[PDB]
Structures are given as C-alpha cells and as structure tokens.
Design a protein around this ligand. Structure first.
Ligand SMILES: [Mg+2]
Lengths: 64, 209, 113, 332, 274, 41
RNA sequence: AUAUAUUUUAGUAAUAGAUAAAAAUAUGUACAGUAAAAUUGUAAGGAAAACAAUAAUAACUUUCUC
C-alpha cells in the first residue's frame, strides 16, 4: 500500500566537485494595492505581478 | 538647573536607499556571475508541451546553436543539454497592465520644499526649528517623554510615536512621525550647514543616514 | 510504466534536482582570477568599514544614553524612574512600514484616525 | 596613485611583463584557439578599476622603529594586485631578484604565509613522527625554511622532501642548504650555524644509541635573496666537522639524518665565535650541550633517513673508512 | 585489528598541522567555499537586502534605545551547582543539576551596542503527515518549499515508530529548509507584504509562542500556502498543498526582545497578552 | 527451571606482573576486561 | 513565413555535503564529528509523529576601526 518512487542507483558526487544549488530566477516586479512597486527574485517566469489583497490595504497593518 | 525637554522628531525613509556607484557595479558583477552559474530554466515543468501559453513563451525564446558533424566551431563545440549551451550564460525573455514604477525623485522636482515630507524619500529626515537654530526644545509632574510628545502635538494637531521613555544626550527624546520659527525637514548631511559646529558635534551621532 | 500522477511527481522532483540543469563550472585566466580576488578583498574591506561605522555610531549613542541617565538620576529622581520604566511590551507602530523599492501612489498620508 | 610611482618603492612591486600589466589595467593563455574560446565575466573592468582605486587610496593612507615600519609597509603593499600576481605565479624556491625580492618585506611576508600553509607543517609532521625533535633537540619554533639538495653525487637536481629515503649513492657527497629566512632580522651582523646530526648509531657498550655529528658549518653569512650554502660561500674556516656520509651498518635500522640550523647570538660588525675545532668530539656528540655552550637558537630544520644497501661499502672505501659492521637480523 | 584502544601520543611543538593540507587527495577541497577556484563557489551579495538595510539604518538604533535599562548587570541563569564540601564523599563527585531543570541555562547579558537583537535564521519544517501512506506527497511538499523559498530543502525522515498513527522509522515525510542572510530576509518580506495579510482571519502571531531564549514560531495551514506568489501564479500546477511550521531564531537574549524585533519587521503580535 | 545452578568459571584476570618486576619482551603484564590500565612506554 | 534534408537535444529520478545519531554495509585503512534526556515553544499536533532553541569566553591569532 505504501506508494513510492523506487529509487535508481544515485550519482556519486565526488568530494570537492559538489556544486551548490543556484536555481534559475528572475527579477520580478511586485505591485502592491497602492502604487508602491517592489523587486524580488523569484523562480516563476513572470516579469510583473500586481496584487489585489496586500498588507497596505488590510486594516490590521494600518490604523489610518 | 532648568529641565529643557529636547525632541528630534524623525521621518523614516520610505524606499530602499540610493546605492553608491562602486557598490552598484559590484552588484551587477555578482548578478552576471550568478547568471553564468545559474541552472537551466526548466520550461518543461512550468509550461506544458502542448499549451498555448507555452507556445507563446517558446516564440519569444531563441535556441542555442547545436552541433553538426563537418563544421568548425572556433568558440568551442556546443555542449548543449536540456536546451542550453552549458559553456555560457543563458537568458529568458518574457486588469492586465504593464507595471510602471513611480519616480524616486519628487524632492528634486520640487527643488524648494525644505518644509516637505515627500522630499528625500530614501533618506532619514529630522525636524528642525528656528529662533542659531535647533531641535524643538520644550520647557515636572508628567513623565518626560510623554510631556515632550504632548508639547509638540499641540503645535500642529500630526501623529507621532515615541520609541521609548529613555532619553538621549543633554534631556532629548526620540520620536517617529506618521502624519502631516520654522517647520524645517533635513537629512543628516544637510543639517551640518544649517547649524553651529559645536552643536553638530554634540548631536552628530544621533542623526542617522 | 508509471501513472500520470507519478510522472508529474517525477517532473516536480527534477525541477529541484541538479540533473542536466547545471552548466559547466566557470574557469578563469590567472590575471582575471587575481583581479576577481582583489575585487572581493576590496568589497570585504568596505563591508568591514561600514560595520565599524555603524557599530561606532551605536556605541556613541549608548554612551550618550548612559550620560543622560546619569544626569537625570542626579537631577529629577522621579523623572529618571519614569524613564527607566522597562519596555517589556513595547511594539513598533505598524504604520511605520519597511522601505520599498519604489514609492507609492500617495507619497505620504496627512489625515489619520 | 602610489602604486604607479617607483621612486622610493623598489621596482619588484610591479609586474615585469608589460603585456600582462596592460591586460590587468584594461592575456596569458598562450594558444589562439583557446583564447578565442575563453569568455571572461562581465563588468570586470570598471569594478576592478574601482577596487584598485580604493586599495591604492588605502595604501597611500598607510604610507608614512624598524620592525613596526616594516609591518606597516607590508600592510600597505599586500593588496596590490601586481605584487600578488608576482608572488602567486612565480617560483619562490629558486627566487629571481626582480620578480620576487625577499629584501622587500611584503614578498617575505607572503613567502612566510605560504610556508605556514604547507611546507612548514609537513616538516613539523616529519620531525614529530620520526622522533627527530625530542630525540635530538627538545623542540623548535619554525622561523625559517631549510631546503637541502645533493647536487654533486649523481648530478641530478632535486629538493629533498622531509623524511625521505636517500640512496647511499645520492648522499655520498655533501649537501647544499637554502635557509630561507623571514621575520625582519638583521643581515650584515647575523651569522648562522648548520649541523647535520644522526642520533641513531649503535652503541654496543650501553646497548643503546649515540649521536654523531656528520657535518658542521659555523659563522655563515646569509642574505634574504642570496641564501644557497654552496662551497663558494662558506670557506674551509667555517667547517667545524667536515662532511661524512651516511654509512648505515647492515640491520642497524633506518638512521635518521636531521639537519639543524641555528642563528648566532647577537651582541658592531659580524660577531664570530671560535669552537675548538679539534677538541669537539664528533663521533659522539651532545647537541643540547653544544647549544647551551654557545647559546644558539635553532631556527629551522630538515631531515632525511638512510638505510643499508649494496652501495654503502663502496662509499666507505671511497671515504677510507672501516669495512663496516654487520648486525643480526633479530631484535634480540 | 589487534588494539581497540584509543590513545593519542602527545607532541613536542606548538605548530597546529591541518593534515588535509599535507594530503594531495582532494585538491578542489583545499580552497575555501567562497574562493572562485572552488567548484563549491557561489556568489553571496548578488544585490542589496532591503529588509536588512531597514534593520541597520532605522531599527537597530531604536532597539538599542528601547531595551536599555540603566545599570542592569548580568542576571546569570541557573547553572550546575557545586557540592558543599561538608563530607568526604563530595570530593570527586559530579555537580548537581540546576535547581530548576535538568538542563543548564544561559546568562542574560544587557542589551548594549555590541549585542543588539537581530534576525539570525529562519527554519521551515513541513512535516506532511499523509506521507506515511504516499511517499510522492513528501516530494511534492519539498518542491513546494523550494518554490516558496529559492534554496534547496532537505528531506525529513520519520525518526520514531508508533503504532497508533501509521508511523514507521526510515520513511521520508516532508522537507526542511534553513534560510539565512539575504534569502531569509526576502522570505520574511514575502511573508509580511503578501501572505500574512492575505490570509482571511489572521489576528497575528500568539504572544505565548516564545521559545524563551529569543526564538519565535508560528504555523501556516494548507490553504494559506496558495497565497504565496510562486504558487498563486499557477493554481493549475498545485492541486495538493501542505501546511508548515516556521521557526525564527534571533540574536535576542529573551523572548520579549525577539518579539519586539519581529514587530519592527511588520509582524502583528495581536494574538495574545504576554 | 525450578532451580538455577548455572554459572561460568572465574576468568583469572588481573595483574600478572607487579611494579618493580623484571619482564622479558612478550611477557603478559595485565589481563583485563576493557582498559582499566592503558599501555605506556 | 513555410517546405525538404541532416543533425542536436527531451528517457526528465533526490545526496550538490568529507554528509555526522532517520533508514541501507557488521571486516581494512585514512580523515573528521558528537550522543541522550529533560525543559520552552510551533498548522492539523496531543501523554505519545516533525523542526527549532537551551553552559562559560579568561587568554591567543588575524582582520576592521577611535
Ligand atoms: Mg564470573
């Protein structure tokens, strides 16, 4: 009943030849509720994302 | 001695600070390095192998020059794997609306308003008052910080927050603004010109960058 | 061989693995390498300087605070006591946001409450 | 722009190859195809220039008693790319004056650092494992490298790795030392001594061993760049015990030959010392005692070890020694 | 093998000896992990960490100010107690475990310029429990984690056995990721600007959630994970999502300080009274 | 097993050669379970 | 833009660290490191799944700085 992916013989990573994980990322533009844009490095392929529900419109983060 | 309750009301910067040139260059270099060393973009996961979006994505991209037996490749033979030349850096092109950022220079445009908060956005500002001229001095039943807060609240009608009851310096309180003889706002460098040297020396370490 | 779900899982796994995705490690000419090293050193030095600056500033501030406390206790004892009152539950404004990359539509708020 | 100037600053602080310098300032990989293939990282130029400017400024700022001054100089220089290039990518052993001057303090410092990184450690390990130190001379604190060579016999060229086995052929004639000093010491007035001792020759009376002094030089003058102790330099007045080769007796273990280097005690000119060349017993020899007598401070050491072989008899004959004893194979 | 008897022979020098350097076996390993020559190289300061900048400029000074009590000296916590020498049996006896607890506790140092509270590290552990049955779930969880963060997670295996729940040792279940430096800052920003706000009924972190030596923790349900950018952009791709715990380690000596620090970074602690 | 009645013999371990005593290469000096004594010079 | 030929990729599968108390290798050597409990916490999660945190820096070296 245990559903698994039965492993292959893994690859031997020699000592000294281990290369660190540098995942492919993009410099994404994040637009908040208001006009404030903020840059973040993200792994998903998209240049721009505007947001509807954010901290800037939520009453908990701002009593104005 | 008489107890004069100082206040250095500060405006906290609202955007990431403007970099140095050298720093910027370094950052660019680092980015380039990262790009060179980055893994391949695994398009096969994000985009499906018979989708319209996927097709569109493909259309933007240009492939790598593969190898064919009989030709000279004087820049090394193309070591291509998973749709990328391993040799070199690899890049990827990309209501619905293009996100255009707001300009980081309204103060510059103004070129005048020293009594304005929307001035140097990426710099820490400090309130300063005229009489030499200096920080809002205010002259014993109440706690000190609270008293200071009360005193300045009356002059406008603004919204501040005291960081703590603990004072600094000669008794000066710190506080942070959140709402809107001279009401003057300045950066840490600008203040040096607008004030006596001795005074500056006394309170130089307070005024942050 | 494998169910569609299994295939999907495999794909997901791959997305994380370094299998076939990682490029060849960058080599460098000796001179280039040297240059890089120099740059790195410079950067490190700069960072250290910055740290010192900030640290120094902090120290100065602390000293100032101490001085104030000393003065205050001598002068107005009640006031000093009040100042001391421990801020065990103090909590930052919340309206006092974190600096963004680019500024908002309304570059500051005037009215409140 | 202090690193561009070369008035007071020695000429060694620059890269002597012009092309390389040019490349650095705005390559070396010889082959044309390879060069074509090569692709450097982006934005290296401007950033590099900026870095250089920064470091140059720092150096200038730094620039202004002797040891302190030397230290300051070293601090000022180290970050110079040119100097780094010179040190890293040119040979430190058989040094070449203009490329790397050990007269120059920065280079010396770098050399010391390099030594600390590996060779020194290796030497220490060899000393400890083979029981060179506690057996002959209580301890040492590295100070200076000492590389030996046996050029005359055979004719080949090789720096001996510490704790090696040398054939009797190889160690038939005397060795050459290179005592690479560091640590801002005087050069005119400072003299050195060198002693090749072997502590494990069979004492039959006690049943233990006794230590023989097989080669002894005293009052040698050294220089930071010029430190090869060849028969050119020392003269016959400086030899207290002339070279005797390793001639291990059969089944007398592996005899450890451990070369010690000491610096003289310092009092106007070069201070010498007599050492009663005749009186000093070389066949059985107390190193510690000797040191105590003349107040030496052992700076550096090296070591090798010899075993019996067919060749040793011939060597003995050549040197005009006895035929050599033979011992039972059992450690009874 | 004859011996079976560990006994290091003492040396006759103060030279340290890093054996690895005398061996030529792993020539790539000889260089540092940040030296360009090493295959283990990766760039560190790719860009500027905005959150860190904020902390440095604005927050650190504030923290220094607020925490400052007047002449507060160390209130060194409960330690192992030495034995009173009123009897000969005490002589070679091990000390008494701390009056309060079994474990020994650290000294609380006063908050000066040298040791201001700061963010040290953020650990995320997503122990998908349904992975006892299906092992692919674990993989999916790990992928999700990776997507969220941008740095390789590590598998979480079931360390214990228990019959009541279907749990057996040696079973991959969930993923754990250690976030540090700029990456961690980025993650925190994402949490604060986007996720925590968007979550429907969130009243903020609980004030009782203090580790007590300046560590804070909180959960996220399986629903809230959809609100992350890397998942929200493709809901088609993520059918199952897995809840997670988030632990935040700080340079704070005490929990209250840590929570104050966190508040500076826009963390609502309206969950309770301390 | 109403009665027990099983046991092994004593192992005769201990010091077999005492301070001051002249050994010869090979002579056993101490027998022991574990190292209550460690090998010296 | 589109057609033909020839090749190149896609078989997507983990650890990326001399890994360090989940499983799997029980004999050699070489190099390295520390366990457990208890307590305080955290989506489902509790008596009992996972993760985090929990002893002192006197002296020393290098680096940056008044
Ligand atoms: Mg028995």
């Amino acid at each position: 009943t245990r559903i698994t992916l039965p492993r292959r013989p893994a690859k031997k990573i020699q000592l000294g030849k281990s290369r660190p994980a540098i995942y492919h990322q993009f410099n994404v533009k994040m637009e908040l509720s208001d006009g404030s844009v903020v840059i973040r490095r993200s792994q998903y392929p998209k240049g721009e994302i505007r947001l509807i529900q954010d901290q800037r419109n939520n009453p908990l983060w701002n009593p104005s | 001695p008489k107890i004069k309750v100082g206040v250095l009301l500060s405006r906290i910067p609202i955007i990431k600070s403007e970099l140095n040139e050298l720093e910027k260059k370094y950052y660019e270099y680092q980015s380039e390095l990262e790009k060179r060393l980055m893994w391949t973009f695994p398009a096969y996961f994000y985009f499906k192998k018979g989708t319209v979006a996927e097709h569109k994505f493909l259309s933007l991209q240009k492939g790598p020059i593969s190898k064919k037996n009989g030709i000279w490749f004087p820049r090394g033979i193309p070591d291509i794997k998973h749709g990328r030349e391993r040799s070199t850096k690899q890049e990827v092109k990309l209501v619905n609306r293009p996100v255009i950022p707001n300009d980081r220079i309204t103060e510059a445009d103004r070129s005048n308003d020293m009594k304005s908060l929307e001035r140097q956005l990426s710099r820490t500002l400090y309130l300063l008052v005229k009489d030499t001229w200096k920080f809002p001095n205010f002259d014993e039943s109440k706690p000190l910080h609270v008293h200071a807060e009360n005193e300045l609240k009356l002059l406008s009608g603004i919204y501040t927050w005291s960081v703590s009851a603990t004072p600094i310096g000669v008794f000066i309180v710190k506080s942070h603004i959140l709402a809107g003889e001279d009401f003057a706002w300045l950066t840490k460098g600008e203040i040096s010109e607008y004030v006596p040297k001795d005074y500056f020396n006394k309170t130089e370490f307070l005024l942050a960058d | 061989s494998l169910s569609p779900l299994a295939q999907r899982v495999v794909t997901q796994l791959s997305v994380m693995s370094a299998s076939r995705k990682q490029p060849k490690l960058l080599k460098l000419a000796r001179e280039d390498l040297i240059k890089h090293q120099t740059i790195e050193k410079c950067w490190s030095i700069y960072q250290q300087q910055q740290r010192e600056r900030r640290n120094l500033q902090l120290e100065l501030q602390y000293k100032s605070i101490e001085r104030s406390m000393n003065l205050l206790q001598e002068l107005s004892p009640r006031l000093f006591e009040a100042a001391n009152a421990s801020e065990k539950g103090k909590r930052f404004p919340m309206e006092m946001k974190v600096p963004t990359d680019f500024p908002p539509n309304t570059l500051w708020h005037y009215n409140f409450r | 722009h202090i690193w561009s100037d070369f008035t007071t600053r020695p000429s060694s602080l620059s890269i002597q190859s012009s092309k390389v310098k040019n490349y650095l300032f705005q390559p070396s990989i010889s082959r044309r195809s390879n060069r074509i293939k090569y692709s450097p990282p982006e934005h290296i130029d401007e950033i590099f220039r900026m870095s250089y400017d920064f470091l140059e400024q720092r150096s200038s700022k730094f620039y202004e008693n002797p040891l302190k001054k030397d230290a300051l100089l070293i601090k000022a220089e180290i970050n110079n790319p040119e100097v780094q290039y010179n040190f890293q990518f040119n040979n430190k052993l058989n040094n070449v004056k203009d490329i790397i001057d050990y007269d120059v303090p920065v280079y010396r410092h770098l050399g010391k650092q390099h030594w600390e990184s590996y060779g020194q450690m290796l030497l220490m390990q060899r000393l400890e494992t083979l029981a060179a130190i506690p057996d002959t001379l209580p301890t040492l604190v590295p100070r200076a490298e000492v590389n030996i060579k046996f050029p005359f016999s055979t004719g080949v060229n090789k720096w001996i790795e510490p704790g090696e086995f040398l054939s009797s052929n190889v160690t038939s004639m005397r060795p050459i030392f290179k005592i690479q000093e560091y640590e801002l010491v005087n050069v005119e007035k400072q003299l050195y001594t060198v002693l090749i001792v072997n502590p494990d020759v069979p004492d039959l009376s006690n049943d233990s061993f006794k230590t023989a002094l097989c080669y002894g030089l005293v009052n040698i003058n050294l220089t930071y760049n010029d430190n090869l102790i060849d028969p050119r330099k020392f003269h016959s007045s400086n030899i207290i015990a002339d070279y005797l080769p390793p001639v291990p007796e059969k089944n007398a273990g592996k005899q450890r030959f451990v070369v010690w280097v000491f610096r003289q005690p310092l009092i106007q000119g070069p201070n010498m010392l007599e050492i009663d060349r005749k009186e000093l017993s070389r066949d059985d020899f107390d190193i510690r005692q000797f040191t105590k007598k003349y107040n030496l401070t052992a700076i550096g050491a090296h070591i090798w070890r010899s075993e019996w072989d067919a060749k040793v008899a011939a060597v003995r004959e050549k040197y005009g020694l006895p035929p050599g004893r033979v011992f039972s194979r059992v450690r009874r | 093998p004859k011996s079976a008897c560990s006994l290091v022979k003492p040396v006759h020098h103060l030279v340290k000896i890093d054996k690895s350097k005398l061996s030529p076996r792993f020539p790539e390993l000889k260089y540092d992990k940040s030296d360009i020559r090493s295959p283990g190289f990766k760039p560190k300061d790719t860009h500027a960490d905005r959150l860190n900048d904020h902390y440095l400029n604005t927050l650190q000074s504030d923290l220094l100010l607020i925490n400052y009590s007047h002449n507060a000296a160390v209130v060194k916590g409960l330690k192992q107690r030495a034995w009173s020498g009123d009897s000969p049996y005490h002589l070679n006896r091990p000390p008494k475990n701390p009056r309060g607890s079994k474990a020994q506790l650290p000294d609380i140092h006063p908050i000066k310029w040298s040791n201001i509270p700061g963010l040290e590290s953020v650990v995320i552990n997503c122990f998908v429990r349904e992975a006892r049955e299906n092992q692919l779930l674990a993989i999916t969880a790990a992928l999700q984690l990776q997507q969220i963060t941008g740095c390789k997670p590590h598998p979480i295996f079931s360390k214990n056995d228990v019959p009541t729940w279907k749990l057996r040792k040696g079973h991959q279940m969930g993923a754990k990721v250690e976030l540090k430096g700029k990456e961690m800052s980025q993650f925190l920003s994402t949490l604060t600007e986007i996720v925590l706000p968007r979550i429907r009924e969130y009243k903020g972190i609980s004030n009782q959630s203090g580790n007590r030596f300046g560590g804070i923790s909180f959960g996220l349900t399986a629903e809230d994970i959809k609100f992350f950018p890397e998942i929200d952009a493709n809901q088609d791709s993520w059918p199952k999502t897995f809840g997670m715990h988030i632990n935040i380690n700080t340079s704070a000596q005490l929990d209250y300080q840590a929570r104050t620090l966190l508040s500076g970074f826009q963390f609502p602690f309206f969950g309770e009274e301390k | 097993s109403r009665t027990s009645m099983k046991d092994s013999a004593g192992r005769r371990l201990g010091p077999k050669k005492y301070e001051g005593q002249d050994v010869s290469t090979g002579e056993i000096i101490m027998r022991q379970r574990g190292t209550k004594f460690y090998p010296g010079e």
